[PDB]
Amino acid sequence: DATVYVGGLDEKVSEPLLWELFLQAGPVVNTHMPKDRVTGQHQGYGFVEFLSEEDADYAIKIMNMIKLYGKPIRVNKA
Amino acid sequence: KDPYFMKNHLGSYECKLCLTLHNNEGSYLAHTQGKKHQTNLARRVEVKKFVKIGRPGYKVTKQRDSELFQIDYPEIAEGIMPRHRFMSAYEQRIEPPDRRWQYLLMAAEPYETIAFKVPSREIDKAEGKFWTHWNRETKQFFLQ
Amino acid sequence: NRFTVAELKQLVARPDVVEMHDVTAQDPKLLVHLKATRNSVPVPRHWCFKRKYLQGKRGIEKPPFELPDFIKRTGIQEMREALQEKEEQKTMKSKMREKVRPKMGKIDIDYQKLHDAFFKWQTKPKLTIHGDLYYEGKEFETRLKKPGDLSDELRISLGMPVGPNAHKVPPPWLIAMQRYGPPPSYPNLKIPGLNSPIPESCSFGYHA
Ligand SMILES: [Zn+2]
C-alpha cells in the first residue's frame, strides 16, 4: 500500500531527480529504481515508497501531470 | 587492436576484463596469452583462416520475374553449396554517406563475393532452404 | 554462553548499534556500550572483507589531480605543461646537449605572485568533522532537495522555468492540488497561489 509504480521514465533520469520530484508531493522513504547491471541502464520504471497508504494514494491522484524529457510520467498503485 | 588494455593514473597497465595490474610494457602482452585472459575471453576460427581467396568476379544475370538471379559459377570441388545473406549498408570498408539500403550478398569459397542492391523494403525472401537451388553438375546457382 | 542478538538487543539501552558479530565478542555488554558511547568513531568497514581495503579500485579510471585555485592562478600549470610537451619532442642528442650548454630562464616567473598566492589568496579547503571516516566507495556516494524548491537541473528536465509569477511558473501539479488539497504529509506546506500569496511567496513553496 505505501508504494507507487512510476512509469515512462527516460533512462537519463537519476534516482536523486526522482527523489527531488516526488518529495514535492509527500515525504519519500525510499526509491527502488531497477537497473540492468550489465549495461548500467535504468529500465523506464521505479517504485517510490511513501510512509503510509494515504500519502501514496494522494501521490497517485496528483502525479499524472509531469513530463520528464518530454515524456509524460505515469503513476499507479502497486 | 586490443580493447581491454588500459593505462591507469600512475603509468602501469591493466587488463580491464580480467581486472589485473601489470607493471611494464612486456607484462601485459604476456598476459594476453594465459588462462586468465583466454577463459575470460571465452566468457565474454580454423575454417575462417583457410578460406581460399582469389577474388574473381563471377557473372550474374539479373532478370525481372513475376508470378531471380542466375550466377554461373566455375568449379568449387567441395560439398558446400554457395550461400546467400541479406546485409545492410551500415557497415562497409569506407563508411561513406548515403548508407541506408540492403544488399543481397552471395559467396562461395575460392573466388569473389557478389552483392545485389535492394531499394524496395520487401519483394522476396533471401532465405537459403526456402528459395535457393544448386545445379552443381552444370555449376549454375539459383535463388528466388 | 554467547547469548544471541535478540537478548543482547533486549539488554542494551541502545540496541541500534549491536551487530551480527558482537554476540561473538568476549564482553558483549561493554562492547555495545562503547559502540554506543557518545563521540567515538566506529571500526573501519573493511575489517571483515577479503580485498585488502583498496584493491577493488582496479579498473576505474580517475582524473590526475585538480590543483587548488590559488595555485592555478600562478600560471605554473600552463608553463610546466608547455615545458613537458616541449621536452617530450627532444631526442637524446639534444637532451644531453642541453645538459652541458643549458638555456636557463625557461620559466623564471616571479616571486611576488607566488608569495601573493600563498599568503594573500590562501583558501581554506573543505575539511570534515572527526567522525567522518573513509571507506572505499565514499567519494562516489555523492547523492547525499526540499519541498517548495526545484533545482535548475530538475527544471530543465521538467521544462519548468523559475520565475516569481506563482501561477505560470508553478509546477504542473498546481491544478490538481487546488482540486484535491495540499500534501497530506506536509500540513504546514504553503504554496503560492494556493495558501500563500502568488507574488509574495515566490520560492515555489515553503514549510511555515
Ligand atoms: Zn586479461
UniProtKB/Swiss-Prot annotation, chain A:
SS bond list: none
Q: State where the protein is found.
A: Nucleus
Give the RRM domain ranges.
2-78
Q: Which residues carry this modification: Phosphotyrosine?
A: Y45
Q: What does this protein do?
A: Component of the 17S U2 SnRNP complex of the spliceosome, a large ribonucleoprotein complex that removes introns from transcribed pre-mRNAs. The 17S U2 SnRNP complex (1) directly participates in early spliceosome assembly and (2) mediates recognition of the intron branch site during pre-mRNA splicing by promoting the selection of the pre-mRNA branch-site adenosine, the nucleophile for the first step of splicing.
Which disease does its entry mention? Acrofacial dysostosis 1, Nager type: A form of acrofacial dysostosis, a group of disorders which are characterized by malformation of the craniofacial skeleton and the limbs. The major facial features of AFD1 include downslanted palpebral fissures, midface retrusion, and micrognathia, the latter of which often requires the placement of a tracheostomy in early childhood. Limb defects typically involve the anterior (radial) elements of the upper limbs and manifest as small or absent thumbs, triphalangeal thumbs, radial hyoplasia or aplasia, and radioulnar synostosis.
Q: Which family is this protein grouped under?
A: Belongs to the SF3B4 family.
**How does this chain assemble?**
Component of the 17S U2 SnRNP complex, a ribonucleoprotein complex that contains small nuclear RNA (snRNA) U2 and a number of specific proteins. Part of the SF3B subcomplex of the 17S U2 SnRNP complex. SF3B associates with the splicing subcomplex SF3A and a 12S RNA unit to form the U2 small nuclear ribonucleoproteins complex (U2 snRNP). SF3B4 has been found in complex spliceosome 'B' and 'C' as well. Component of the minor (U12-type spliceosome) spliceosome. Found in a complex with PRMT9, SF3B2 and SF3B4.
What is this protein called in UniProt? Splicing factor 3B subunit 4
The UniProt gene name for this protein comes to: SF3B4
UniProtKB/Swiss-Prot annotation, chain B:
BP GO annotations: mRNA 3'-splice site recognition; mRNA processing; mRNA splicing, via spliceosome; positive regulation of neuron projection development; spliceosomal complex assembly; U2-type prespliceosome assembly
Alphabetically ordered keywords of this record:
Acetylation, Metal-binding, mRNA processing, mRNA splicing, Nucleus, Phosphoprotein, Repeat, Spliceosome, Zinc, Zinc-finger
Iron as a keyword of this entry, yes or no, is no
Superkingdom to which the source organism belongs:
Eukaryota
**Where does this protein chiefly localize?**
nucleus
Phosphoserine: residues carrying this PTM: S88
Look up the record and report any one GO term of the cellular component aspect.
Answer: U2 snRNP
Q: Name one GO molecular function term.
A: zinc ion binding
Compartments annotated for it: namely: Nucleus
Q: Does the keyword Metal-binding apply?
A: yes
Q: Where are the zinc fingers (Matrin-type)?
A: 13-43
The leader peptide range reads none
Give the multimer and partner information: Component of the 17S U2 SnRNP complex, a ribonucleoprotein complex that contains small nuclear RNA (snRNA) U2 and a number of specific proteins. Part of the SF3A subcomplex of the 17S U2 SnRNP complex which is composed of three subunits; SF3A3/SAP61, SF3A2/SAP62 and SF3A1/SAP114. SF3A associates with the splicing factor SF3B and a 12S RNA unit to form the mature 17S U2 small nuclear ribonucleoprotein complex (17S U2 snRNP). Identified in the spliceosome 'E' complex, a precursor of the spliceosome 'A' complex. Identified in the spliceosome 'A' and 'B' complexes.
Instruction: Give the record's family classification.
Output: Belongs to the SF3A2 family.
Q: What does this protein do?
A: Component of the 17S U2 SnRNP complex of the spliceosome, a large ribonucleoprotein complex that removes introns from transcribed pre-mRNAs. The 17S U2 SnRNP complex (1) directly participates in early spliceosome assembly and (2) mediates recognition of the intron branch site during pre-mRNA splicing by promoting the selection of the pre-mRNA branch-site adenosine, the nucleophile for the first step of splicing.
Protein name, UniProt field = Splicing factor 3A subunit 2
Origin organism of this chain?
A: Homo sapiens (Human)
Swiss-Prot record, chain C:
The reported effect of R38K is:
Does not affect methylation by PRMT9
- Reported effect, K50A: Moderately diminished formation of omega-N monomethylarginine but greatly reduced formation of symmetrical dimethylarginine
Q: Which residues carry this modification: Symmetric dimethylarginine?
A: R51
Drop me one GO molecular function for this one.
RNA binding
Query: Any idea which UniProt keywords this protein has?
Result: Acetylation, Coiled coil, Disease variant, Host-virus interaction, Isopeptide bond, Methylation, mRNA processing, mRNA splicing, Nucleus, Phosphoprotein, Spliceosome, Ubl conjugation
Q: Where is this cross-link: Glycyl lysine isopeptide (Lys-Gly) (interchain with G-Cter in SUMO2)?
A: K35, K86
Q: Where is this region: Required for interaction with PRMT9?
A: 1-93
| Annotated consequence of substituting R45K | Does not affect methylation by PRMT9
Per the record, the domain of life is Eukaryota
The UniProt-reported impact of R51K is: Abolishes interaction with SMN1; Abolishes methylation by PRMT9. Abolishes formation of omega-N monomethylarginine and formation of symmetrical dimethylarginine
Which of the residues bear the PTM Omega-N-methylarginine? R51, R58
Query: Which disease is this protein implicated in?
Result: Craniofacial microsomia 1: A form of craniofacial microsomia, a disorder characterized by a spectrum of craniofacial malformations ranging from isolated microtia with or without aural atresia to underdevelopment of the mandible, maxilla, orbit, facial soft tissue, and/or facial nerve. CFM1 is an autosomal dominant form characterized by mandibular hypoplasia, microtia, facial and preauricular skin tags, epibulbar dermoids, and lateral oral clefts. Affected individuals also present skeletal and cardiac abnormalities.
* Name the UniProt record assigns to this protein: Splicing factor 3B subunit 2
- Can you name the source organism? Homo sapiens (Human)
Describe which stretch of the whole protein the shown chain covers, with first residue, last residue and complete length. Answer: 458 to 667 of 895
